[PDB]
Amino acid sequence: CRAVCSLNTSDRCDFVKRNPDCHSEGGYLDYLKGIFCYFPPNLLPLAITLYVFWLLYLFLILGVTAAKFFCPNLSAISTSLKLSHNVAGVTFLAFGNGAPDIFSALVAFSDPRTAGLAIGALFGAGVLVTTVVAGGITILRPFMAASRPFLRDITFYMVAVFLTFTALYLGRITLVWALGYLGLYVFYVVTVIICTWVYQRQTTGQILLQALNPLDYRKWRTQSISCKLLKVAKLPVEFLLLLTVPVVDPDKDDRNWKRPLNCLQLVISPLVLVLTLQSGVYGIYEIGGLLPVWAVVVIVGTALASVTFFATSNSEPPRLHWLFAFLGFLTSALWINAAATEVVNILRSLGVVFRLSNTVLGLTLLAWGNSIGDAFSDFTLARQGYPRMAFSACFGGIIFNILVGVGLGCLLQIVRSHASEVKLEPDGLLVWVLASALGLSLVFSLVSVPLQCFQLSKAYGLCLLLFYICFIVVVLLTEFGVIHL
Amino acid sequence: CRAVCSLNTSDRCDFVKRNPDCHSEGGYLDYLKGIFCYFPPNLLPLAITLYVFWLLYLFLILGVTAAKFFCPNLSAISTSLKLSHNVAGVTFLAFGNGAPDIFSALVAFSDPRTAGLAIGALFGAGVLVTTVVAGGITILRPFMAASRPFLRDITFYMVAVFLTFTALYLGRITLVWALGYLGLYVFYVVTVIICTWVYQRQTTGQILLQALNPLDYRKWRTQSISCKLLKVAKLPVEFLLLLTVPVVDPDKDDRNWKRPLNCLQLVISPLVLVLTLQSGVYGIYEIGGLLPVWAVVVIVGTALASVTFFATSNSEPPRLHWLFAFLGFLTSALWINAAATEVVNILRSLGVVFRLSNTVLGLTLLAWGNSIGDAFSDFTLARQGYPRMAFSACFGGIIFNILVGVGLGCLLQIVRSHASEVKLEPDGLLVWVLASALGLSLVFSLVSVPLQCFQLSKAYGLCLLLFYICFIVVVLLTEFGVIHL
Amino acid sequence: CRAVCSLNTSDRCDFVKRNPDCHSEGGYLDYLKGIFCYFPPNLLPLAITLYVFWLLYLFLILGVTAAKFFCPNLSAISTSLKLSHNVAGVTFLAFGNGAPDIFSALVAFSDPRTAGLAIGALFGAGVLVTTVVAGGITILRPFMAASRPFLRDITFYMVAVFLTFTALYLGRITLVWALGYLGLYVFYVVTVIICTWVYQRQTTGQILLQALNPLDYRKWRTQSISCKLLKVAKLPVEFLLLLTVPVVDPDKDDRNWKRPLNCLQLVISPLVLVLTLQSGVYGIYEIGGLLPVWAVVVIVGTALASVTFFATSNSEPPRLHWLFAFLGFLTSALWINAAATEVVNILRSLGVVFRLSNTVLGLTLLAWGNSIGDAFSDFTLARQGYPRMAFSACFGGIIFNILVGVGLGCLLQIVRSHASEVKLEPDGLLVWVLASALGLSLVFSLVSVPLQCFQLSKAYGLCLLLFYICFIVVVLLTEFGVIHL
């Protein structure tokens, strides 16, 4: 595929249409076809810009679904769990800030050609969240960090980073390695729980229309008009997400019980699940050569919706209300998956056009897109007067991200392909530099925080920011071939 | 010329005397001839050291003429123009920058062989003043920086830097590009004015001999004798300036009216103007084969001086006193020009001897020499209790420097040579690194200042200083060929 | 020697017994012999983990000796003589921290092949001390440094470093150079003394058992389990130190006067000195083959002790009590040095275990082990409340090592080998990289500290720490072939 830019403009469409390598196995849109066939060559740059804009919008979706629905379903599950809030919070951070990272890594690992992207998505994020975002917190609100939790988190992160480093050096990932990764993560969770325990011991239709609306005019008037316009674009996407994903909030006395809305959703959610799973391949499968799956799915869904609507009341939620959250969980995750897939495809297309390495795309665009949610949530938490929790999560979430993403992606690739091993092909020297940078950053913290007696100030954040700038300098020099063995 | 160091010592004088390329088109002294003919080879190092000392002294002149006479004439013009003082002060700061940076850039661009020097003079200064000098202010007096002016200045500087970056990548400068540069600068000035308006709305001979002396005995008495000896060397240069350049001070009730001194100056200033313009080429031109220009110039000057002396009184300045400032402007600028030329020539000579690239000389010696005045003025302003003005000027002056210098130099080169374009030949990889460094510095500020809520502290200055040290490390490695594609 | 790893386990011990190039001395135990012959051949790791624990125990010993005996004795010495902090740091702490470095430099200059390794180790130790030790000193306790002594010391250090640079560039050192180094150091000491003088002008049994008891039962009762275990671990070495090293503390009314214990120490400490210095070569030496040195030593010590012994009462401490502190200093310094050597022994075994470039091993392994004592002493002194003295020592001691070690090594090599010169072989570009790093650190300090108004804050140390970490990462990347110079 990469030779496409070296051919005449009159043969680009034929080469793209004829080469199997130039076709993506998953997704709804063929971006390369749009670049090289739908648009004239003279408008080639603008189109790319448009793609970037589209890419950014995707990440916005990956934010909202992660924060308002995945987390709400997780919170309802947590209330059923009655888990300790600190234990729930460690689970929540992976559920909230790191879910897009896991789904992007899984989608990238699903195809060997994008495998180099996946690691580039992870380590680069580890470089960013550790250096910029964490540093930003120390700039916004100086505070005193807890000693023992910080030491535990940094030690576990160092162990995970070294394990992935030696795995990359070995050039392969086996099934037992992924199982060990998952075991290490569950060990970390159990250790956190045990340490915390030890430390502690020592009209109705009009109301439905208002619920349907994602925005309030008085709230919009309060909101800055430019902010409101950005919110309005988000609201249409949010309304579409609401039109399909149920949310269960244990903090509400009514548990967000909307009888006719949820009765419609018992039909809507199975339909979108079937039509979106595996890009809808299961959707058009025709049973016995007569009836498609989607028709019988819709029939069963409307029958169940009618039964539930006639079997329940608008005043008292049904005893099986919690099961809704389970559905509100699954579809939500699936939605994120779909979005993740699109992003990966777009990046691959760019790699074809600009002849860029997969690692550069993984550590620059995908990392920023996946960490924008981390940045927003952490800055909001720090500004509101809780810097300790934000800083603790800034290291807690990255360990969960790396371990769960790598382990789950490798496990699913082993199971699906019936292969005994995932081959990691290191894209030249650059990848090593990336790993090196990450380790260095940790060393700085491992010396900087204890030397200040755990009282974090502004200079620490400024130094971390300058470190990230130097890292991007080194990466930019390495990419353009200025330094080369 | 560069092969001179590869020849036998017995042929160096002949090669220098015979090669047209080894001769400079402008200046009063042939430095290469002095290095290779006047002095014996065994004293080659000492001579170079002497040159460096001489070079430093030139920059001292470039300081004084910029601060005491160019600015004073501008201040009188500003009172006549009745322009707002803050706008006038930015113009005065630009005039001070122009004497030290615009004139050097113009002289460098006047000759293609030194063209690479000019850009090296600009970007390097942008690296220095932004990193060291600005940082120094934050070390001397922590303060709170204004938000909107800082954002406006940094945005305009980023736009100018990116424009010059793409111009360098294109490898050429056209006439329309220089006109666009000048239009952008005038747009920036108009925008500053409009924003400020919107924000605000929302014996007599013995006395003449005393005036002739440049040092106040009382002030000098307090000053250290070694400092006074340095001041005395400056005072002789100041006396030469007082001797030839008139100064009009609107703050003085008498407007610095010295009737016989100025009557002598009406003869002195035209003579030095004619004898110095274009290295005096117009001076020896002989009219009609009988009379040189300088003789008739002196005759007209003494006639006008006698008329003015007999037509005015020592108590009341004449109605046309302001016109004096105009003269006191022009000659002053011309004086700076002469000094600038010398400096450039010296640097070129060194490039011949040490086989050094033009960019290294531009970003190391010329940048420091041109920015010593910025450093002194900004540190003096910060120490006196006005850090906000100094920090604002630290970014305001650089935009004016880059835009006006590049635009005016390119425009004058197009007009003089009747060529349609100025060719920018990038001296290898190093120049790119220089540009990169500048951009990165801005990014740091663009993240560092807002993250601190515009309250600048000591750590910011220390980090900027360390950044400049790292930049000089990279430049030193690049020059000596340690890193090479 | 590394070939013993690939050789059969049965003959490994015999190969070690008859293999050279693995028999470094200066220690007391053959670690490789213990690993490969004693402990069960099939328990390789068992010895390993134990050794790791042993290493940790060593870091405990250096933690105690510096905290309880070295620094209080040195402070008592400084207070008794009314010396300024700068003078004490320049002379006494400098000698105590620089003796092992000088011994290593001599033992390395004994072989002409290892001259480059020795000079590189000296440069690396200088870089580490001037950056990381100073950074920790400034971070742990902010303070205001003396301006004139700091400028003087940094100027002398820069002169010495540039002289070493020139000597390395010439690739040879003659008798004149070594004599000049010695004369320069003597002149530095004389200048220190002269300037300081000019500025100044302008029953017994129960008390013996109680003094030897390191456990305070009242304090013992209230500690936690971990603290109690740590105290139990520290008890034996603390008791041995109490028995060996006298201590004088002017903060107590009795000045820690233990008359019988001090009388016994008057015999114990000199015996330890003679039996330990140069691994007991002087101890085994016989005076005329009839009387060994140790016998005369113990006889004289017992006679002097009985002078003190004749008056049983402790009561009032003698006017010469502060002289004991001098002894309590010297022996204490020895208790540091030996420990540091043992730390290296394990590193040398690690160097034997994993192949490393000899220069690369020398630059980091031979400098961290050499400067671990300096780092411990400086950090302890900074914690106790004397930052000025440690900060001044941070440059005085390094001047001491460079000047005295280089001069003495060159002089001894010239005298012993009867050669007219000592040839320095530059091993690769890593030596020049080390030199450039040292120069950059010195320039950064000289530019930053005066610009900071001599108020050394935490940002200076943090920035230095970042610089050192980045430099170490760059060096490690260069050695492994990632970056080709």
Curated annotation (Swiss-Prot), chains A, B, C:
Superkingdom of source: Eukaryota
Extracellular topological intervals: 1-43, 110-116, 175, 250-263, 308-319, 370-394, 450-462
Keyword flag Cell division: no
Record localization: Mitochondrion inner membrane
Activity regulation description: Inhibited by the sodium/calcium exchanger inhibitor CGP-37157. Strongly inhibited by zinc.
Primary residence: mitochondrion
InterPro entries linked: CaCA_antiporter, NaCa_Exmemb, NCX_ion-bd_dom_sf
UniProt note on tissues of expression: Widely expressed. Present at higher level in pancreas, stomach, skeletal muscle and skin (at protein level). Ubiquitously expressed.
GO biological process entries: calcium export from the mitochondrion; calcium ion transmembrane transport; glucose homeostasis; intracellular calcium ion homeostasis; mitochondrial calcium ion homeostasis; mitochondrial calcium ion transmembrane transport; regulation of cardiac muscle cell membrane potential; regulation of cytosolic calcium ion concentration
Reaction(s) this enzyme catalyzes, per UniProt: Ca(2+)(in) + 3 Na(+)(out) = Ca(2+)(out) + 3 Na(+)(in); 3 Li(+)(out) + Ca(2+)(in) = 3 Li(+)(in) + Ca(2+)(out)
Annotated transmembrane regions: 44-64, 89-109, 117-137, 154-174, 176-195, 229-249, 264-284, 287-307, 320-340, 349-369, 395-415, 429-449, 463-483
Entry membrane topology: Multi-pass membrane protein
Keywords: Antiport, Calcium, Calcium transport, Glycoprotein, Ion transport, Lithium, Membrane, Mitochondrion, Mitochondrion inner membrane, Phosphoprotein, Sensory transduction, Signal, Sodium, Sodium transport, Transmembrane, Transmembrane helix, Transport
Record's GO cellular component terms: membrane; mitochondrial crista; mitochondrial inner membrane; mitochondrial membrane; mitochondrion; plasma membrane; sarcolemma
Cytoplasmic side: 65-88, 138-153, 285-286, 341-348, 416-428
Gene Ontology terms for molecular function: calcium:sodium antiporter activity; calcium:sodium antiporter activity involved in regulation of cardiac muscle cell membrane potential; identical protein binding; protein homodimerization activity
Function: Mitochondrial sodium/calcium antiporter that mediates sodium-dependent calcium efflux from mitochondrion, by mediating the exchange of 3 sodium ions per 1 calcium ion. Plays a central role in mitochondrial calcium homeostasis by mediating mitochondrial calcium extrusion: calcium efflux is essential for mitochondrial function and cell survival, notably in cardiomyocytes.
Family, as annotated: Belongs to the Ca(2+):cation antiporter (CaCA) (TC 2.A.19) family. SLC24A subfamily.
Protein known as: Mitochondrial sodium/calcium exchanger protein
Provenance organism: Rattus norvegicus (Rat)
Gene from which the chain derives: Slc8b1
